[PDB]
C-alpha cells in the first residue's frame, strides 16, 4: 500500500505457440502475477505461498512451460475452478490476508487496480461498473486487502447487458482446503 | 516509453510538482501562476485557472499518463513527494489529513502539486500545503479531486 501495478509483455504470438508445443521456456520470470496463454485463451496466474494458481476454465489440466520442459499441475479442483503449479523460479509470492477486511482491490491484466466492496465469502461489488470486455482475460488475478495481501482469485463477473457490476472469486481459504 | 503520472516542475524561482488526472496536468496556482507550460512546440496555455481553489491545469504533456480518481472513499492516504518517498496520511476533513509520522518541513518541501493516493493508488487530492508547527509538518492541506472534476465542468 498504496497498491500499484505495471505490466510487461515478454513473448509474442509466434514464440508463445512454439513454446506451447515444446513446453520449454528459457525466459526469466519476475513478479507476483503471470500473464498466461494457451492456444485459445489468455488469462492470469497468481503466485501465493510458493504456488502459482489460476482458473481451471482457462488452464484445464495443462502443463506449464518451464526451463526444464513441461511441469505438471500440483493441484486440480474442477468444482472450485482452481489449478496450481509450483511457482516458477524467479517469481515472487503474495501472502494470504489475515485482517479479515472488507475493502478489496482487484488487479486486472491491464495492471489497473480496481476497488471492490466485499459482500459475502466469495462475492464483491464494483464501486464503479465496467464493460465485461474490460475484465475479460483477468480470471486468475488477485483480490487484495489494503495491505497488499491476497484475499481471493478472480473467477467470474456478475454481468448484465455487457456491464459487470460485481465479481465472484475463489477465497484464499479454499486454496488451503484444496492443498488438503 | 515508460510514462509518469507525476511531473517535477520548475519556474525561475520555485520547484514543485504537477499531477496528471483525466488528461489534465494539474498543479498549484501559488506555484505556477498564470504561466504557460513548456513544450517542444513552444508554450502551452492553461486550460483551467481557478484562483479560489489554488488550482491550475494544462493539457497533459508528452511522457505522461493519467491517474484515475479515487472512488472507494477510503481515509488511508499516501502522499508522494518530489523525492518519490511515500508518506502515510489519515484523512480528517474534506481537504485535510494528518501524517502518521510527522517529519521536518524540508522533507515535504517542493512537493506541492503532488498526489494524495488511496490504497488503490487512485487520486484523492492534490497536495496544496504543509500544515506546520515549529519546522515540523504534522498535517497536510489538499485540493480534493471532486474540485478538479467540477472545475472541468
Amino acid at each position: 500500500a498504496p497498491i500499484t501495478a505495471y505490466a510487461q509483455q515478454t513473448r509474442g504470438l509466434l514464440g508463445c505457440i512454439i513454446t506451447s508445443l515444446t513446453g520449454r521456456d528459457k525466459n526469466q520470470v519476475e513478479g507476483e502475477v503471470q500473464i498466461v496463454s494457451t492456444a485459445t485463451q489468455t488469462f492470469l496466474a497468481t503466485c501465493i505461498n510458493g504456488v502459482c494458481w489460476t482458473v481451471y476454465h482457462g488452464a484445464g489440466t495443462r502443463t506449464i512451460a518451464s526451463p526444464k520442459g513441461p511441469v505438471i499441475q500440483m493441484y486440480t479442483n474442477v468444482d472450485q475452478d482452481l489449478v496450481g503449479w509450483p511457482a516458477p523460479q524467479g517469481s515472487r509470492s503474495l501472502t494470504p490476508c489475515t485482517c479479515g477486511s472488507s475493502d478489496l482491490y482487484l488487479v486486472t491484466r491491464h495492471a489497473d487496480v480496481i476497488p471492490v466492496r466485499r459482500r459475502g465469502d466469495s462475492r464483491g461489488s464494483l464501486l464503479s461498473p465496467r464493460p465485461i470486455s474490460y475484465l475479460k482475460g483477468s480470471a486468475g488475478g488477485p483480490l487484495l486487502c489494503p495491505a497488499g495481501h491476497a484475499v481471493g482469485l478472480f473467477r467470474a463477473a456478475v454481468c448484465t447487458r455487457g456491464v459487470a457490476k460485481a465479481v465472484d472469486f475463489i477465497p484464499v481459504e479454499n486454496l488451503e482446503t484444496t492443498m488438503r | 516509453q515508460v510514462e509518469g503520472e507525476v511531473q517535477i516542475v520548475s519556474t525561475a524561482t520555485q520547484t514543485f510538482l504537477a499531477t496528471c488526472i483525466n488528461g489534465v496536468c494539474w498543479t498549484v496556482y501559488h506555484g505556477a501562476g498564470t504561466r504557460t507550460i513548456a513544450s517542444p512546440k513552444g508554450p502551452v496555455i492553461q486550460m483551467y485557472t481557478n484562483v479560489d481553489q489554488d488550482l491550475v491545469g494544462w493539457p497533459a504533456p508528452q511522457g505522461s499518463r493519467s491517474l484515475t480518481p479515487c472512488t472507494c472513499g477510503s481515509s488511508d492516504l499516501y502522499l508522494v513527494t518530489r523525492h518519490a518517498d511515500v508518506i502515510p496520511v489519515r484523512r480528517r476533513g474534506d481537504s485535510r489529513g494528518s501524517l502518521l509520522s510527522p517529519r521536518p518541513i524540508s522533507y515535504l518541501k517542493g512537493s506541492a502539486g503532488g498526489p494524495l493516493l488511496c490504497p488503490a493508488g487512485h487520486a484523492v487530492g492534490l497536495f496544496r500545503a504543509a500544515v506546520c508547527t515549529r519546522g515540523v509538518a504534522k498535517a497536510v492541506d489538499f485540493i480534493p479531486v471532486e474540485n478538479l472534476e467540477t472545475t472541468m465542468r
Binding site: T38, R62, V107, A111 | A84, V86
Partner: peptide, 21 residues
C-alpha cells in the same frame, strides 16, 4: 494439448520512482 505459457507479467512490488535519464 499445448502447455500454458507465460507471455507477460504484472509487478505489484514496485514503488514510486523517479524515471532515470
Amino acid at each position: 494439448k499445448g502447455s500454458v505459457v507465460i507471455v507477460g507479467r504484472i509487478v505489484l512490488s514496485g514503488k514510486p520512482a523517479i524515471i532515470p535519464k
